[PDB]
Amino acid sequence: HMSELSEIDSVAGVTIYSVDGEPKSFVYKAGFAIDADGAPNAYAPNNGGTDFTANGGDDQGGDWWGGPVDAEGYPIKQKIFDPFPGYYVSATAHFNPAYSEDSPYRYIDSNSIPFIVLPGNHSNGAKLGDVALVYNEKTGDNCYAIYGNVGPSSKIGEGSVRLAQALKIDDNPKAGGTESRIVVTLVFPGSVGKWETPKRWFSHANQLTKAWGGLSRLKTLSDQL
C-alpha cells in the first residue's frame, strides 16, 4: 500500500515529505555523497588520509573544519592510544560525551557506524542521534542509521563510509558515492536525541520500523518519490 505524503521542505531540488501517520517520520529520495568525517583515518598531513587533506580545510593554521584544532589553529593529531597515531582527529556534529573534544573516540567513526547527514538548517525536527531507515532502490539493500553529522545547508543526500558499504554504494571518500537519486532515507525525528550504544539505537530503529510497517512499506513508498 502506498503512503500519504505531505511536503515539509525542499533542498537542492529534493522534496522532503512528512509521511502521514504514526510513528512520526519524514522521507526523501536523493543521491549519496560519502562523508568520511569522524573516521580516524580520514585526514592526515601530506594527503595521508582516506580523503585529501584539503577536503577538511587548511591544515597549516587556516580555516580547518575537519576536526578540532590546537591553540595555534593546527589540527589535533591522534596520540599513541588513538586508532591512527599522527593522523588528524576528525569530528562529527554528533558526539559521545564520555570523551574529550581532542579525542577521536568522541566522534562517530564513519568507517564503522552507519550514519546519515542532514543539511544544516534542514533537520526538520530531527536531533543528532535520532534513527533512520535507509534503502537503496537499485541494489535492494537497506540499513538502520543515526543522524550523525550536519552538512551544507544547500546539499542533501550524504552519509558514512559504513552506510555506503551496507547500501552497496562505492564507499571511497575520494571518488565514491553517487549523484543518482537512488537512496531513500526515512528519518524518525524525536526517536533518540542523544548518544547511546549502537546496539541500543539499532534496536530502537528496528522497533520503530516494525511499528511503521517495515521495509516492505518503504519499498512501495520509494516508487512514489
Residue numbers in the entry: 0 to 224
What does the published report state?
One expressed protein showing endo-chitosanase activity (V-Csn) is crystalized and structurally characterized at ultra-high resolution, thus representing the structure of a soil viral AMG product. The structure consisted of two non-contiguous structural domains. Our rigorous analyses not only resulted in a crystal structure of a soil viral AMG product, but also enabled us to propose the mode of action of this previously uncharacterized chitosanase enzyme in the GH75 family of glycosyl hydrolases.
Based upon a partial alignment of the V-Csn, A. fumigatus, F. solani, and S. avermitilis sequences, the corresponding residues in V-Csn are D148 and E157. Two V-Csn constructs harboring either a D148N substitution or a E157Q substitution were generated, and the activities of the respective mutant enzymes measured. Superposition of the two mutant structures onto the wild-type apo1 structure gave RMSDs of 0.11 and 0.07 Å, respectively, for all Cα positions, suggesting very little conformational differences between the mutant and the wild-type structures. Co-crystallization of both mutant proteins with chitohexaose (a β-(1-4)-linked polymer of six D-glucosamine (GlcN) residues) gave a complex with the E157Q mutant only.
